Amino acid sequence: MILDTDYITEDGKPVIRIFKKENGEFKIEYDRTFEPYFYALLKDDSAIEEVKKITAERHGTVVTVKRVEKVQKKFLGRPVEVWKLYFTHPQDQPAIRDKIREHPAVIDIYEYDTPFAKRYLIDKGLVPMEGDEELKMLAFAIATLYHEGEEFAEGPILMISYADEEGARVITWKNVDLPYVDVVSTEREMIKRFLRVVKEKDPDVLITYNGDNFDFAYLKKRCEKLGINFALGRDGSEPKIQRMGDRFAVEVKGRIHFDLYPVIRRTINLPTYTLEAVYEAVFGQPKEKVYAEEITTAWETGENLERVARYSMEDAKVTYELGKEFLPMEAQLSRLIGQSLWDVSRSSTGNLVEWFLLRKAYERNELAPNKPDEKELARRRQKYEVKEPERGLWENIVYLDFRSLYPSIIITHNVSPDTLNREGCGEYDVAPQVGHRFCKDLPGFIPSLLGDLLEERQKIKKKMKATIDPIERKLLDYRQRLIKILANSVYGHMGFENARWYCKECAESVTAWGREYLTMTIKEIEEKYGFKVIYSDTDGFFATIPGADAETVKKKAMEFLKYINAKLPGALELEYEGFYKRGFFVTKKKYAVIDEEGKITTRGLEIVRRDWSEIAKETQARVLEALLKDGDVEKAVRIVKEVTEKLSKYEVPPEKLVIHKQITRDLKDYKATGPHVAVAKRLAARGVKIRPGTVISYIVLKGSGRIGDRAIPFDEFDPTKHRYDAEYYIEKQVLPAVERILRAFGYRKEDLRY
DNA sequence: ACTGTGGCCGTGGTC
DNA sequence: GACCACGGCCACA
Ligand SMILES: [Mg+2]
Ligand SMILES: [Mg+2]
Ligand SMILES: [Mg+2]
Ligand SMILES: [Mg+2]
Secondary structure (H helix, E strand, O other): OEEEEEEEEEOOEEEEEEEEEEOOEEEEEEEOOOOOEEEEEEOOHHHHHHHHOOOEEEOOEEEOEEEEEEEEEEEOOEEEEEEEEEEOOHHHHHHHHHHHHHOOOEEEEEOOOOOHHHHHHHHOOOOEOOOOOOOOEEEEEEEEOOOOOOOOOOOOEEEEEEEEOOEEEEEEOOOOOOOOEEEOOOHHHHHHHHHHHHHHHOOOEEEEOOOOOOHHHHHHHHHHHHOOOOOOOOOOOOOEEEEEOOEEEEEOOOOEEEEHHHHHHHHOOOOOOOHHHHHHHHHOOOOOOOOHHHHHHHHHHOOOHHHHHHHHHHHHHHHHHHHHHHHHHHHHHHHHHOOOHHHHOOOOHHHHHHHHHHHHHHHOOEOOOOOOOHHHHHHOOOOOOOOOOOOOEEEEEEEEEEOOHHHHHHHHOOOOOOOEOOOOOOOEEEOOOOOOEEEOOOOOHHHHHHHHHHHHHHHHHHHHHOOOOHHHHHHHHHHHHHHHHHHHHHHHHOOOOOOOOOOHHHHHHHHHHHHHHHHHHHHHHHHOOOOEEEEEOOOEEEEEOOOOOHHHHHHHHHHHHHHHHHHOOOOOOEEEEEEEEEEEEEEOOEEEEEOOOOOEEEEOOOOOOOOOOHHHHHHHHHHHHHHHOOOOHHHHHHHHHHHHHHHHOOOOOHHHHOEEEEOOOOHHHOOOOOHHHHHHHHHHHHOOOOOOOOEEEEEEEOOOOOHHHHEEEHHHOOOOOOOEOHHHHHHHHHHHHHHHHHHOOOOOHHHOOO
């Protein structure tokens, strides 16, 4: 199994290293014969000699074209003759590529900015993370001594914690009597102890959380201060800082630094991304947070240091658990993209798509088109630009959707930049409305690879059902799901402004075909099957037979699938997603349906909005049940009049009136002072410490004037000298919760209260 | 350019 | 009345 590749330099020449793990053994393969290159397209094939003589300067040396060779690659669908230019060293290219491009006889240059070690992976057809190899993993965290006004890492590192399958431990230079704590003399001997542990365990993977920006940079600054060779690399090197945009990232040679933060940040969407919040979201169990000022106070007074020891241990432990949870998916992703786990764990699929396409382009000898320049990226920028669902309560609803609508469209009509308006074909498909014509004589680049992807995904869903190993099944699943994402990302790439295979005509052709096939499918189910489509968005629809039992709907639906799938061209295929006993649809992307087993599902309808109070969420839930499990609209509206009256009589437990709002920043950085902010500023003066991330649990008291002036914290609430604002919780919590739901039923806000 | 972007919204509060 | 800061949805894996 290939972990990664880099290169070093021996006497000015590049030496590819290939870090590998085979049969549980770590190996470094050296390749001293791989040559950097890029392509050039010339006005006349005779001007090659003058191009060979183009020189530049890097450092105190002359940059020369080592050698050239004439090759034939596909470009815009047809074979072309281009000159493959070779050089001595990777770093030669950025110094001479502009001189070759500025040459008059050179029309353009291609594939000139490919990182040398990633180029090696593609040309040699190597795939990271492929094989059986069980990777050894170890996670680690640090706890430091902060003081406001100090430079970064000016204070020492207090504790270092690690965690693996053998447990979680902490190393520190103050005596803490706990069985998972090892005590050393100094911060120096602590960092040295950590280095020994890592060398001893020899992990393939080091897992951090924000290690790219905090942990390694702190360990670095302390190691330079204390003169420690922080030789975490398997080749004796120190961790290496790479800059990815304004972002910083850290690699450890021979291992994989898996920083969880960039992976979590694009897989789940949370208000803030603390380790504790992420562990909560992923595993449901809580994690206590000890703050910088608390850790500093504890270290200085020696009090409650065991609490900081447990927090350090927990940081490591949950980071190892998060690592075991999220690495296999990312490993499958890198195997699919054909790039390193280090790389794919730090980039969005919209950008990983180009690496996948670029590998496909090499596999099929297709000259990759260049990324756009500034003027071109300007012309590609275009401004952002469906019938409202049917009102009422609907019963016996089925949802039918298209299997990979946009990918199937690309494959069925051979949509691709290299097929758009290709002259001299005998068969074209014409896109509705936008009129673009795509050749059908030869398969296109994008459709051909999208076909292999969709076919692969189908094979893997079959092998999934024929696998008893739950580990193997889970990895197959990850692969199948990522394929679906990658195919859609390939469609999206065709519309991306910075995309190499950009093609606006291809993209708007695909949406045009999508609208045509969707409206067609709806017209067929209503006209020839008596269905009524209730709701539709892009690639699926809800529908039922008006006035029909459940079985008649389900059976007649499966018949429509046989009918429409036969009528549909090519890879266009409709499928059956689910049945729903009842459901109502408010507006686009806002609806509620109930599964026969009772499980209710909702689209953006607010149900966990923490912005809201328990009294409002409760009423919303009860209204949904009376609407979907009971079908009584009047029972729902009765519930609303019951709760609004119970609030007005001060008969609702104040505990259900607490509004939990998160403070996002420092109070000094708040321009508009809202109700939770006004409580936070009031608490800060009384002596409390508020900080970015604190939660304010407040209640609104009865009064005129600003809401913030009547808001007190709930632990400050006394039911005998405080009266809550019943009108506020009626008109601005419960009624706004249920108004949009019951406006689709013709009930106006004035019909829901007292 | 996922300690960022894009789209839709709403509300508390100056001025 | 007019406008803004600041949050909540849905995407971006
Ligand atoms: Mg290029
Ligand atoms: Mg720690
Ligand atoms: Mg760092
Ligand atoms: Mg190539």
